[PDB]
Structure formats: structure tokens, C-alpha cells
């Protein structure tokens, strides 16, 4: 119940939110480092920085002065240096030649009772520096205390996208040698854009020298009383409570115990008596990967949207776009289009998902007929010229074309269908020059009474209104079949990781699963397969041409029995599809019933009334 910080800067009031980021595991086996003079345990080792270090320090004389972040620490790669001497707080980013045992020296005088820093042995030299920060000067105490620990300092560090985030909060404590248990939400302090890769880091301490420590510089010194702890950051799901003040007072875990995971799904801090699904063996994801085809050619969107001429309304041209990548942002940010109402797709999700093929249809039509392009419309255009189905995917693009498509006189170069005896089918184009008839007598191609041409010319005069102006319309029709996609949006392509619960992004779909080798043979024109439960369990991976079966990290289906949070924290866990290894823990008092295997509960030979249903006639109760 420690190390909880603020994941986002969004102000939340009386709401519960579940986030996914690099958090500290609950009740973890943190490393203990001790430094007591008495003996002479001046431990400042080099330990890896996997994804984040939670630092817990119990200080009473300010013996910790700074920290060193870097990769090699041999003046070969850029390193981050933070230090807090007796004057300022200096943060510099250079390529330092670090010593084997860096330290800071404080000297004490017997003649006059005063403490002043004397030795500063951290780095040898610094050649190239990029970032430097110097704080305001101040005076520190630096006086030794004969009492116990009084000040507790907690630090959490993260390195995401080259950004260094430091969270700190000071809380007074009164202990001797223990970790103070309590909830204290850490607040953001300073974000440093170092942009360096950090793999190992080392703790820096201080040295005390006086007349009571004879010898040379390497032996005439003492250590005093100090203690600090180090905890790693693991990507796990958590639930945080935000009150009206905005400070987190308590939180629950979703990966520590099966009883804790009940609070995560219920989204509450109190668990009532009942049955919860929870998980069988849930492993939290540690990475996110994406996979997309290696196509890098740009789609010919310039030809469609900047054609020298546009087709007629009835004889609208159709263009097929494939074998490229299409970016939907450069057309959106053109600040020239006038129609962007889309059905079934979203501008934000247009760069994530893709389809089998993309169709382009270009014609010119008026604004009152631009709004008639929508599938739920009828009229001379929406029923006789162009029909879209009710399940149409995508949208059309229209923009003002007052400069073009107009002459000094009437521009009669574009026509449209006016007369038709039947409703047009969706996605159908008709070019018929037959003489339309309305009378009972047949028409032999003459232009007499009740015999008129179905095509009607358009008057595109420059003096018409805004709604009567000719607007260039481009129709994008997205179709997604079971065939492999040949065109997809522009996204990155990461590597492949096996036998781990990882986040996979295959051909626009994302989720959680484990990538494993598969022996199945798949027909070429099918990409994805599904099981009986209609769940995705196979990907094609066209980059490597290897079939990977999606393995669920935890299938669930595990009963958890809780007598009550107010009563006791002990819970009973029953596994349905497990016959009594796939458990959270073996525990004790393992009992096997017809409905499943029960652990954590004692089986008796008596028969009382049913308190909570378990299954197959089995009942359990909380007794003495």
C-alpha cells in the first residue's frame, strides 16, 4: 500500500478510473540496504533500472545527496547526474568519467562545532553537456542526530519516450528499523526531457570525518546510521480513488491476490458475499507491439482529388486504390473540403483499421444534391443516379468548385438522369440513351409528345446561389472482405515477442494474448480464424509468413467465495474447469467437488443449511 502516484493530470472528482502504467507491486520483496557505523556497511552497489525504481529512504541527518543515471558510466554514453550539495540542487547532463566509489565528504571540527562539506568526489571530467539546471542557493543543517529516523523520503522515477518524471513527498515518521506502512500519494515535481537510455543506476551517500576517525582518506571515515530501500516498477492494473480534494487516499490491487481482483472488477472498495469470475492465472502485460504490411508506397489520392476533368453524374468514374498506404490527415487538414459526415468510420480510427480495397468515385453535383448523396435519402439523384446501401462503409468528400466548372455562359457539359421507371440498385451506374416514354403508345425513338430524353442538362451559371453552385464530389467506398488487405494506414512496425502475455496489433485489431507457434495449415485467401466461441485465435502475420495462435493469458471461470470484507479478509477460491499447476497458489485444505476444486476452505463431514451456493449440492459457511 505504497508508491501510488498520479498517472494523469486530469482532475477527477468522486469517480474511479482504472489505468495501465508502470506501477509498484504490492507487498513486493524489496531489497534492504543498511549502513550502521556501530558494521562499516557502506553499500552503494550498481543495480539495473528495468522499468522504474521506487526509492524509500529513512533519513535523519541528510546522508543521501544525489543519484547517478546512465548506461555505461565510463564517459562513453550520455548520463544523467543529479546532486544536492550543501549549497544548491545541481542537475547536469554530460558524459562523466565516474569513479568506482563516488561519495561526498563532510568534515567536523573539534575546536568549533560546525559541519561543512569538504570533499566532492563524483566524476572526473565532463566534455560535452546538453542539459543543465541549477536551483536557488540554500543553507542545510548537515548535523548528526543521536535519535532515531525522523524524515521519510519517497521517490519514483519513470523513463517513457525520453521523459524523466520525479514524484516526491515528505512524511514524518518515528521508527527504528522498519518500512513505515501507510498511504501517501506522491505529487509531480519536475519533468526532465533527457532523452537518454538508462539501464543501471547507483546510490550516492555522504561521508563524515572528524578527529575520532584516524587514518588516511580511504580508511579514516565513518558511516553513521542510515537505511534505504529499492522497489521496482512493474506494469500492472490498478484502481485509484479520487476524493473532492483531489488527493489519492487509498487504492486497491488487481494482480496481488484473487480477493484483490474482486475489487478491480466490481470497482468498489467493499466486497459483498457472492461469486466473482476474477481470473485463473492472470499475467499482466509488459509490452505493446504492432504489425503491419511492409508496403511504403503512397496512394494516388492526388489524381482523384485534383483531376483536370470530372465525370458526369450518371456516368461517374470509378477508381480502385490498392497496394499502397493512405494517410487521411493531409486531406482532412487541407481546410478546403465541405462534407465530412461519415457513417461507420471515424477520423481518429481511420489511421488504425483498414479494409480489403478502397474505391473512389468522382462527379460534380450541387450542394442540395451533395446532402442527397447520403444513403437515407430519396429524390432524382438519391434514387435514379447513385444509390448507397444502408450498411455503407466510409463517406464522401465534397468541396467548393466555383472557380472551375463554369464559363461566361451556361456550362452545359454535365448531365444527370431525370426519368426512370424503376428504383436503382445500390452501387449501380446506368448509362442509357433510350427514349423515355410515358404514354401507352410505344415510342420508336421519336421526340414527340410523352417522349423525352431521360438526361437533363445542368445550368452551371456563375450567378447562381451557394446551394446551386457545382461542387466537386469524391466518394470513398470502403469494402472489407475475408481476403488479405493490400492497403492499410500508415503506422509503425515493431518486432515480434514469443511466449509472453503481450499486446498485439495485427491488421488493425488489438488485444491481449500470447504468441506461439502453430502447426495449422491455412488456405491462402483467408487471414483470420475463430473457435467455437467466436474468439480470434489465429493471425497470419504476412511480414514473416508464420501462423501464430492467440493464447489467452487467463481464461477465467474461477469462483471466489468471500464471507464478507467487514468480517475477515480470508477468502475461498473454487476452480470450475480444474480437476484436483494452474492455480494462483496451492495453499492448503484442497477439496475436490463435482462442480470443481475448492482451495482455502476446510471440508467437514456434517451437513448444515446452505449459506452460500457453491455448486453440485456443495455448501460452505464461515464458522469457528
Amino acid at each position, epitope marked *: 500500500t505504497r508508491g501510488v502516484y498520479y498517472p494523469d493530470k486530469v482532475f477527477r472528482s468522486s469517480v474511479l478510473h482504472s489505468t495501465q502504467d508502470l506501477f509498484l507491486p504490492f507487498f513486493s520483496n524489496v531489497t534492504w540496504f543498511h549502513a550502521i557505523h556501530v558494521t562499516k556497511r557502506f553499500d552503494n552497489p550498481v543495480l539495473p533500472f528495468n522499468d522504474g525504481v521506487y526509492f524509500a529512504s529513512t533519513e535523519k541527518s541528510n546522508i543521501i545527496r544525489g543519484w547517478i543515471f546512465g548506461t555505461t558510466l565510463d564517459s562513453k554514453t550520455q548520463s544523467l547526474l543529479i546532486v544536492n550539495n550543501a549549497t544548491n540542487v545541481v542537475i547536469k547532463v554530460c558524459e562523466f568519467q565516474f569513479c568506482n566509489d563516488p561519495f561526498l565528504g563532510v568534515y567536523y571540527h573539534k575546536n568549533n562545532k560546525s559541519w561543512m562539506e569538504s570533499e566532492f568526489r563524483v566524476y572526473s571530467s565532463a566534455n560535452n553537456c546538453t542539459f543543465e539546471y541549477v536551483s536557488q542557493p540554500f543553507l542545510m543543517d548537515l548535523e548528526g542526530k543521536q535519535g532515531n529516523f525522523k524524515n521519510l523520503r519517497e521517490f519514483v522515477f519513470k523513463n517513457i519516450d525520453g521523459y524523466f518524471k520525479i514524484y516526491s513527498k515528505h512524511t514524518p515518521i518515528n521508527l527504528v528499523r522498519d518500512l513505515p506502512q501507510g498511504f501517501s500519494a506522491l505529487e509531480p515535481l519536475v519533468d526532465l526531457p533527457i532523452g537518454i537510455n538508462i539501464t543501471r543506476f547507483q546510490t550516492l551517500l555522504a561521508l563524515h570525518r572528524s578527529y575520532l576517525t584516524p587514518g588516511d582518506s580511504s580508511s579514516g571515515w565513518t558511516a553513521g546510521a542510515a537505511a534505504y530501500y529499492v522497489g521496482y516498477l512493474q506494469p500492472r492494473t490498478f484502481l485509484l480513488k479520487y476524493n473532492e480534494n483531489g488527493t489519492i487516499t487509498d487504492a486497491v490491487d488487481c494482480a496481488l491476490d484473487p480477493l484483490s481482483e474482486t475489487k478491480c472488477t466490481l470497482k468498489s472498495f467493499t466486497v459483498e458475499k457472492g461469486i466473482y469470475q476474477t481470473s485463473n492465472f492472470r499475467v499482466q502485460p509488459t509490452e505493446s507491439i504492432v504489425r503491419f504490411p511492409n508496403i511504403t508506397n503512397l496512394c494516388p489520392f492526388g489524381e482523384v482529388f485534383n483531376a483536370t476533368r470530372f465525370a458526369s453524374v450518371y456516368a461517374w468514374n470509378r*477508381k480502385r486504390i490498392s497496394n499502397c498506404v493512405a494517410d487521411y490527415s493531409v486531406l482532412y487538414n487541407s481546410a478546403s473540403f465541405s462534407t465530412f459526415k461519415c457513417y461507420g468510420v471515424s477520423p481518429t480510427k481511420l489511421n488504425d483499421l483498414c479494409f480489403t480495397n478502397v474505391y473512389a468515385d468522382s462527379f460534380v453535383i450541387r450542394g442540395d444534391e451533395v446532402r442527397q448523396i447520403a444513403p437515407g435519402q430519396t429524390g432524382k439523384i438519391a434514387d435514379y443516379n447513385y444509390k448507397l446501401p444502408d450498411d455503407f462503409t466510409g463517406c464522401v468528400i465534397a468541396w467548393n468548385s466555383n472557380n472551375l466548372d463554369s464559363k461566361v455562359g451556361g456550362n452545359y457539359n454535365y448531365l444527370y438522369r431525370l426519368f426512370r421507371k424503376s428504383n436503382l440498385k445500390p452501387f449501380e451506374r446506368d448509362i442509357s440513351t433510350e427514349i423515355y416514354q410515358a404514354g401507352s403508345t410505344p415510342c420508336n425513338g421519336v421526340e414527340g409528345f410523352n417522349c423525352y430524353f431521360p438526361l437533363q442538362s445542368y445550368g452551371f451559371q456563375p450567378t447562381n446561389g451557394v446551394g446551386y453552385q457545382p461542387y466537386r464530389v469524391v466518394v470513398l467506398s470502403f469494402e472489407l472482405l475475408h481476403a488479405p488487405a493490400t492497403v492499410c494506414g500508415p503506422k509503425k512496425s515493431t518486432n515480434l515477442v514469443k511466449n509472453k502475455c503481450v499486446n498485439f496489433n495485427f491488421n488493425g485489431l488489438t488485444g491481449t494474448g500470447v504468441l506461439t507457434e502453430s502447426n495449422k495449415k491455412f488456405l491462402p485467401f483467408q487471414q483470420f480464424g475463430r473457435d467455437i466461441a467466436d474468439t480470434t485465435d489465429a493471425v497470419r502475420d504476412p511480414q514473416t509468413l508464420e501462423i501464430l495462435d492467440i493464447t489467452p493469458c487467463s481464461f477465467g471461470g474461477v469462483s471466489v467465495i468471500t464471507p464478507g470484507t467487514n468480517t475477515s479478509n480470508q477468502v475461498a477460491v473454487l476452480y470450475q474447469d480444474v480437476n484436483c499447476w494452474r492455480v494462483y497458489s496451492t495453499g492448503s485444505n484442497v477439496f475436490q467437488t463435482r462442480a470443481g476444486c475448492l482451495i482455502g476452505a476446510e471440508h467437514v463431514n456434517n451437513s448444515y443449511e446452505c449459506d452460500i451456493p457453491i455448486g453440485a449440492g456443495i455448501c460452505a459457511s464461515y464458522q469457528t
Partner: antibody
Amino acid sequence: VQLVESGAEVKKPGSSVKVSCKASGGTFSSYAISWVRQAPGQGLEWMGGIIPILGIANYAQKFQGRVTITADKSTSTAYMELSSLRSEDTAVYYCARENGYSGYGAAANFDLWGRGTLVTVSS
Amino acid sequence: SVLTQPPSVSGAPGQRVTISCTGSSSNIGAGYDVHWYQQLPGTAPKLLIYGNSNRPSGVPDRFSGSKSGTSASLAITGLQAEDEADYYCQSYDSSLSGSVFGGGTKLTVLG
């Protein structure tokens, strides 16, 4: 019906030609009339087409605004007036009669053709 | 002549000859159909197959055609002495904004 064109025409490198495609046994009705050329050793191109019931012409991208096609509806005769002749243009010309239909394709098919007008350039 | 056609093909009186006309996705690979034309050496061309499944009047039953994907086929049941002609495939082009013909193929059966 049948389509009757003119005879062989000989012109100059930089003159103007004017051929006609008359109709015998019936008028053009309301079907659009197109013009298709054919060069020896090459394929068939498409200069453009005319709608006789409205007098509207739709040209191609390869042929610029130097050739104008006109079709008189009363006499049922189309024209292929072209200017700035070049020695490459030694092809014959046919007047094509399109026949539309209903379907997902909507590709124009030339049902009735002409008989050819051999236009040659000789300085 | 953007649509691809073989320069020349060979046939025999009694076998089957298949001619493939594959073009770009904007004209052939799109929804537009194909129209086959037969041009005798000395006679104006005439429409052979329209709509990819229908046959106009005067067209013998030996001429058949089909379309699948981005290709067109011209299947002829037997080859006669009058079959020595150039065959062309015509389809509507969206980029060209006009109808265009194929490159043409030569079918010579003589000895």
C-alpha cells in the same frame, strides 16, 4: 440501319479537314454517336463522342481543343472537323454508334460502325 | 492501347485458343466490363461480345467470353478461314475519362 461516310481525303501538313458520317435507312434516334480512329500498325483510339439529341461533345485527354465534332440532328449527320494536321495522322476514321445497358459495368459498346475515311497527309 | 494484348498468337483448325487482356485497376480491374471487337483486314470492325455474357445477333455460338478479377478472356470453339482478324478489348477508363481499346492481337491460321 447503316452508316455512310465520305470518300478518301488528301490534305496538307497544316490544313483543315472536314468529313461527314451520314445515316441511311434511319436517323441516329437518341443513341450517342462516337468517332473511333485506327492507324496501320497501331491500335484504335477514341477522339470523342456526340449526343445528337442535345449537341453535346465529350473529348479525350490525348486530343486537345484543336478538333471539334458536330452532329446535325435534323439531317442525322455527324462531323469530325480537325485542324493542324500532322504527318503522323495518316489513319482511317469510323463513326461509332454506342448502345447502353443496365448493369454494374456500364461500359459503352459500339454496336454499329461506319465504313472508314482514309485521311492521308502529303506535302 | 493501354490494355495489354499479345502481339501475335497461333491457332490450328480444331483446337481452342484463349486470348488474355489484362489492364490497369482503374479501367480493367474496376467495375467496368469489356467489349470484344473483330476487325477483318479490309472490313470495318464490328461488336463481337458485349456485357461479357451476352451475344448480339449474327454472332456465332463458338465465340464466348468471361471476366474474372483484372483479366478478360476470349474463348473461340474452333478456328475457321475467316477467323484471321485482329481482336481488341475495350473498357471505360476513369483516369483517361474516355473509352479506350486494347493493344490488339494477330491470329493467323494459314499454310
